[PDB]
Design an enzyme around this catalytic site. Structure first.
Site, PDB file in Angstrom:
ATOM      1  N   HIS A  44      -5.211   7.369  -2.100  1.00  0.00           N
ATOM      2  CA  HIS A  44      -6.171   6.441  -1.534  1.00  0.00           C
ATOM      3  C   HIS A  44      -7.352   6.204  -2.453  1.00  0.00           C
ATOM      4  CE1 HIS A  44      -4.664   7.405   2.787  1.00  0.00           C
ATOM      5  NE2 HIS A  44      -4.028   6.363   2.280  1.00  0.00           N
ATOM      6  N   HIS A  78       1.783   4.635  -2.811  1.00  0.00           N
ATOM      7  CA  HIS A  78       1.936   6.076  -2.579  1.00  0.00           C
ATOM      8  C   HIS A  78       3.253   6.587  -3.167  1.00  0.00           C
ATOM      9  CE1 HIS A  78      -1.652   6.943  -0.406  1.00  0.00           C
ATOM     10  NE2 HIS A  78      -1.340   6.269   0.690  1.00  0.00           N
ATOM     11  N   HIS A  85       0.827  -1.207   0.000  1.00  0.00           N
ATOM     12  CA  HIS A  85       0.000   0.000   0.000  1.00  0.00           C
ATOM     13  C   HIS A  85       0.867   1.266   0.000  1.00  0.00           C
ATOM     14  CE1 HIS A  85      -3.157   2.931   1.329  1.00  0.00           C
ATOM     15  NE2 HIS A  85      -2.123   3.441   1.972  1.00  0.00           N
ATOM     16  N   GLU A  86       1.870   1.329   0.872  1.00  0.00           N
ATOM     17  CA  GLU A  86       2.657   2.558   0.994  1.00  0.00           C
ATOM     18  C   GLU A  86       3.568   2.777  -0.208  1.00  0.00           C
ATOM     19  OE1 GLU A  86       1.685   4.412   3.324  1.00  0.00           O
ATOM     20  OE2 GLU A  86       0.689   2.960   4.617  1.00  0.00           O
TER      21      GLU A  86
HETATM   22 ZN   LIG Z   1      -2.385   5.497   2.526  1.00  0.00          ZN
END
Ligand SMILES: [Zn+2]
Ligand SMILES: [Ca+2]
Ligand SMILES: [Ca+2]
Ligand SMILES: [Ca+2]
Ligand SMILES: [Zn+2]
EC number: 3.4.24.17
Lengths: 174, 161
Positions: free
Chosen positions: B125, B119, B115-116
């Site tokens: 998100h 980014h 997930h990170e």
């Molecule tokens: Zn996040």
């Protein structure tokens, strides 16, 4: 930014400020702190009367856990539960923030008078995996996420973690 | 305007800090599939550095740790990361006041890390709960068949084709 959202009880107990307010404007970004600010107006206060507040601060970007207000204000009242850091109300992606009218009665009760009842001997404990492991008689296991797939479930919307007798906390209905 | 994306396809990374929660071998493995998950659907690549400045710098920390955004001890925020760019941009940070696990019996490094990375690659998100770019820790029963959401795929392919 990755969160474990907290139970409403946990939101209440561990927040310095719990208020109901309306977002009134676009965020203003303050480089110098790396934070941005939303102008609100406080329409009721439940926790924090050791204050009188009209701004909310959160990080400037989503990735680093900054809260972005989706709504554009019907003059929706929002329940905000957050930290007071250096005089300032602070919230993140993980904070409990939600439109007041979308909460159940069971949550409105609680935020008003019922949550503070189990605030500091009882603990709501989030279950990630399903061995889960209970820590103590004062923990309630929060299984909404595992069992129904999203923290917006039954324990969260109708139950609270309250004492039964000293040393024992149990899920209990509002 | 302002749509951040790496202008270089070939990317570099470094694991600078390590958690005690897992073996030093585990931390590495977790990170690899984390990147490979993105690598699979893009023309990106990743090379590892053990020294100096990598593009995506990987760290474990607690509370104040050299940026604007203190971690908050056990729970709540698990990690955060930065959009592409120089310096701290691209980096990802992990709160070592969590208990990082290889499996799902705690907080899974692989799941949080991928997930990170998303980014670090430039994604925001998602509102879809099955999406890896969803901000609430999913925690799933069999990491075996964890799959990248289509939203995820579309997002990263919209940036890098
Ligand atoms: Zn996040
Ligand atoms: Ca944390
Ligand atoms: Ca960087
Ligand atoms: Ca740890
Ligand atoms: Zn950080």
């Amino acid at each position: 930014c990755t969160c474990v959202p907290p139970h409403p009880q946990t939101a209440f107990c561990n927040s310095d400020l719990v208020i109901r307010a309306k977002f009134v404007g676009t965020p203003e970004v303050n480089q110098t702190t790396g934070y941005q600010r939303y102008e609100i107006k406080m329409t009721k206060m439940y926790k924090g009367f050791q204050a009188d507040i009209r701004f909310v601060y959160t990080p400037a970007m989503e990735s680093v856990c900054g809260y972005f207000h989706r709504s554009h204000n019907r003059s929706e009242e929002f329940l905000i539960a957050g930290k007071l850091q250096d005089g300032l109300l602070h919230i993140t992606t993980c904070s409990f923030v939600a439109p007041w009218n979308s909460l159940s009665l069971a949550q409105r009760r609680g935020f008003t008078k019922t949550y503070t009842v189990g605030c500091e001997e009882c603990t709501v404990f989030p279950c990630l995996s399903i061995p889960c492991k209970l820590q103590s008689g004062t923990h309630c296991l929060w299984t909404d996420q595992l069992l129904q797939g999203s923290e917006k479930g039954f324990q969260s919307r109708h139950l609270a973690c309250l004492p039964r007798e000293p040393g024992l906390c149990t899920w209990q209905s509002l | 305007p302002g749509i951040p994306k790496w202008r270089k396809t070939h990317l570099t990374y470094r694991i600078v800090n390590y958690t005690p929660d897992l073996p030093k071998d585990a931390v590495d493995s977790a990170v690899e599939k984390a990147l490979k998950v993105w690598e699979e659907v893009t023309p990106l690549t990743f090379s590892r550095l053990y020294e100096g400045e990598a593009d995506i710098m990987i760290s474990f920390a607690v509370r104040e740790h050299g940026d604007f955004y203190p971690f908050d001890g056990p729970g709540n925020v698990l990690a955060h990361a930065y959009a592409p760019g120089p310096g701290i941009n691209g980096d990802a940070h992990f709160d070592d006041d969590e208990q990082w696990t290889k499996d799902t019996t705690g907080t899974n490094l692989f799941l949080v890390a991928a997930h990170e990375i998303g980014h670090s690659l430039g994604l925001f998100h998602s509102a879809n709960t099955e999406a890896l770019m969803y901000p609430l820790y999913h925690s799933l029963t069999d990491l075996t068949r964890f799959r990248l959401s289509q939203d995820d795929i579309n997002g990263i392919q919209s940036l890098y084709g």
